Specification:
The structure holds two protein chains of two kinds. By secondary structure, chain A is an all-beta fold. Helix content of chain A is 0%, strand content 32%. Chain A has one domain: Ribbon (Laminin). Chain B contains three helices and 13 strands. Chain B has a seven-stranded antiparallel β-sheet with strand order 1-9-8-11-12-13-10, with no helix packed on it. The longest helix of chain B is centred in the last third of the chain and has 9 residues. Classes of the chains: A mainly beta, B mainly beta. The structure holds the ligand O=C(Nc1ccc(-n2ccccc2=O)cn1)[C@H]1C[C@](O)(c2ccc(F)cc2F)CN1C(=O)Nc1ccc(Cl)cc1 and calcium ion. Chain B: This is Activated factor Xa heavy chain. Chain B: It comes from Homo sapiens (Human).
Chain lengths: 50, 234
């Protein structure tokens, strides 16, 4: 589950009812696939390109 | 930072610098949000009054991207003491909001359990700052960063002349001449996970800098996540 490559989550991983639940830090939203974290510019934790 | 490399454009955007009335950097900080900076409680004794500079990479010259913010509220952990250096943590509320831009952005605050199982079990973290580039040297002009291995907890209890509490963790090298140093205190230790950087430590203290058989000592942010959250709301 979360022990296997972070449950395939981009960020936070929890095991609820023996299944993976992904979540994201503030300023990100959880994608439709329930795994990717989508920035809502200058999201936390990203080096700046512009 | 002893050794390491220069932060190139945009590489260390969560770095804050606490500056004295002489506009001189004495400690670091981490950008948590537009209003809040993470630093060390012990930095608060190193200056009567101070401000926070964001967006700086070279202190010699003012390029244009830098911005200075005055401090509205200082929140120092009420259990810090110079005797132990335990609970070495503070949060600053700024009077005006940070404008995120190139070289100015926050690092992510992680969740406690995930951080401990996933970030702190990483091979390495990254520490940054404007501190000395050698033990006896002068404060650095350029912002630097250094990858520091996480260090086995028993390995670094054995190495320390002072008690390592559960609010601390060790990072760096046994004999390799790379470490954080004085002037880097208060600044970021972040851990990279899938190209996203989470704050994991606050540069705290060490015996000298880059010494053989000694490690860099950092405040364990995961021990204070609830305290940080509370400080940012109340
Ligand atoms: O303040 C310092 N050291 C210090 C302070 C307090 C304690 N300490 C720790 C626990 C309990 C009591 C206590 O005093 C230990 N070292 C300064 C002077 C320092 O010891 C020092 C010594 C000889 C020198 F020639 C120059 C120096 F700057 C190095 N310091 C420092 O903070 N280094 C450091 C900090 C963070 C990291 Cl990640 C790596 C290195
Ligand atoms: Ca500058």
């Amino acid at each position: 589950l979360c022990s296997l490559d972070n449950g395939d989550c981009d960020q936070f991983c929890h095991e609820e009812q023996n299944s993976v639940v992904c979540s994201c830090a503030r300023g990100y939203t959880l994608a439709d696939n329930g795994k990717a974290c989508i920035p809502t510019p200058y999201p936390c934790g990203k080096q700046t390109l512009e | 930072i002893v050794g390491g490399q220069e932060c190139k454009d945009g590489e260390c955007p969560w770095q804050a610098l606490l500056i004295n009335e002489e506009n001189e950097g004495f400690c670091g900080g981490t950008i948590l949000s537009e209003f809040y900076i993470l630093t060390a409680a012990h930095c608060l004794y190193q200056a009567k009054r101070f401000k926070v500079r964001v967006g700086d990479r070279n202190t010699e010259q003012e390029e244009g991207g830098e911005a200075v913010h005055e401090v509205e509220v200082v929140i120092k952990h009420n259990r810090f003491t110079k005797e132990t250096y335990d609970f070495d943590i503070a949060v600053l509320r700024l009077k005006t909001p940070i404008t995120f831009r190139m070289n100015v952005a926050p690092a992510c605050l992680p969740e406690r359990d995930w951080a401990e199982s996933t970030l702190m079990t990483q091979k390495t973290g990254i520490v940054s700052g404007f501190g000395r580039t050698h033990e006896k040297g002068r404060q650095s002009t350029r912002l630097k960063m250094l990858e520091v291995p996480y260090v086995d907890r028993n390995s670094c209890k054995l190495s320390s002349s002072f008690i390592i509490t559960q609010n601390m963790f060790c990072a760096g090298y046994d004999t390799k001449q790379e470490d954080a140093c004085q002037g880097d205190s208060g600044g970021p230790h972040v851990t990279r996970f899938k190209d996203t950087y989470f704050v994991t430590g606050i540069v705290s203290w060490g015996e000298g800098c880059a010494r053989k058989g000694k490690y860099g000592i950092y405040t364990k942010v995961t021990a204070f996540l609830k305290w940080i959250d509370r400080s940012m709301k109340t």
